[model samples]
Target: FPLASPDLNNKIINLVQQACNYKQLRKGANEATKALNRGIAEIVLLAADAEPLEILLHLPLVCEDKNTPYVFVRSKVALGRACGVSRPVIAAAITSKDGSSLSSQITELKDQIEQ
Candidate 1:
């Protein structure tokens, strides 16, 4: 599932929260896929424990198609929390924005995920 290490997982969660505030986050599989297809997604995140995980299985493929980095976190609940939503999230993407304060951190995170 390309699950992230604990350290990286924490970083991603924290970054998600920040991305939400910056309005640079796309929530849910559909939106995440859209972000990838539009070439705006900087990174994709999937929930390892999503029920019927196949629901989001295709995201990794889309990410590959777009040459975007992706990683799985342990819980959809936590992901939802990071996204500032009340429901669990099966998939999410951090979208790119020019001059965004989060750009450098997103780049570093992508490099770490690719490693």
Candidate 2:
């Protein structure tokens, strides 16, 4: 399911907005799925309007099994553009690495969504 709260959803967008600048945002369903499987995804954001939708359907379940936060947003075009990518994207995984400046904000989003 998509995030139920506008506040949280917007916060997520804001978090991702910063993560894009940090280069910690991983785009695409396959990459995000791998991140979830490896426990590296701090947050998973997918497009709710995806054609067929099944391409990214397995994400939420994996996120749940991994105890990760995931959400479905309104547009892949907007998301892709926001992330400065050339093509539309169905999913994204925000990953953390050593000295990554997005760590704290990602942690904050994780805790917020979990709540």
Candidate 3:
């Protein structure tokens, strides 16, 4: 059976940091969806433990059908911290302008996820 990748937190946290540095981090579902619609999201990170779950459910559908990739983590607190925000966020999108430096890293990460 396929299992979740090991060292998930480290990879995700680093990706979040990279997103911030690259100015690609989009916090909240609304912005995430906008990024998806705009075709700029590199990947999406979602808090799986979000209360109600409904607020973030549509994102998976969008991610699945769109050009971007997404994953869910066990804690919103950690995700919020990664986003450098004071409150919990159910979703975040990594986006970029033309010729983003992080695109290669995002490609490799998705390749690993497909393994």
Candidate 4:
């Protein structure tokens, strides 16, 4: 259970925006969890304010087993904005892409989250 700081939250949102542009982002609990199961998730993001929060509680456990970095943001509305989706998203995953322009930034963010 990592709750990102304000600074980290903004950074993550920006990264999610960029990932969306590159088609390297997966939105929604099912898709994100699938990415984790497939070993393709670079980072997992969950919205802390989801109604019935237990619905997505399994993501953290899967992330733990997969050894992936994960963090929670304060709002699904903001997360939806980042994902460029009309509806709120309970979870999102920044997935792997070989030789991606975002690789360095993603790695850096992972370090920050783990810290």
lDDT of 4: 0.90
lDDT of 1 by residue, 17-47 (tens): 9999999999998898889888999999999
lDDT of 4 by residue, 2-65 (tens): 8878787898999999999999999999899889889999999999987776756777888988
Return whichever of 1 and 2 wins on TM-score: 1
Candidate 3's TM-score reads: 0.85
Per-model TM-score, in order, reads: 0.94, 0.83, 0.85, 0.95
Clashes of each: 0, 0, 0, 0
Residues 1-115 of candidate 2 have per-residue lDDT tens digits of 6653656656666777788888888888888888887878888988877766677677787888898888776778766766678788778989878888778888877776656
> Clash pairs of candidate 2?
none
lDDT of 3 by residue, 28-108 (tens): 888889999999887787887777667667777878898577887667777788888888877888786678788888777
Q: Of models 1 and 4, which has the larger lDDT?
A: 4
Q: Of the candidates numbered 2 and 4, which has the greater TM-score value?
A: 4
Give the C-alpha lDDT of model 2.
0.78
Global lDDT of each candidate: 0.89, 0.78, 0.77, 0.90
Worst 10 residues of 4 by lDDT: 50-59
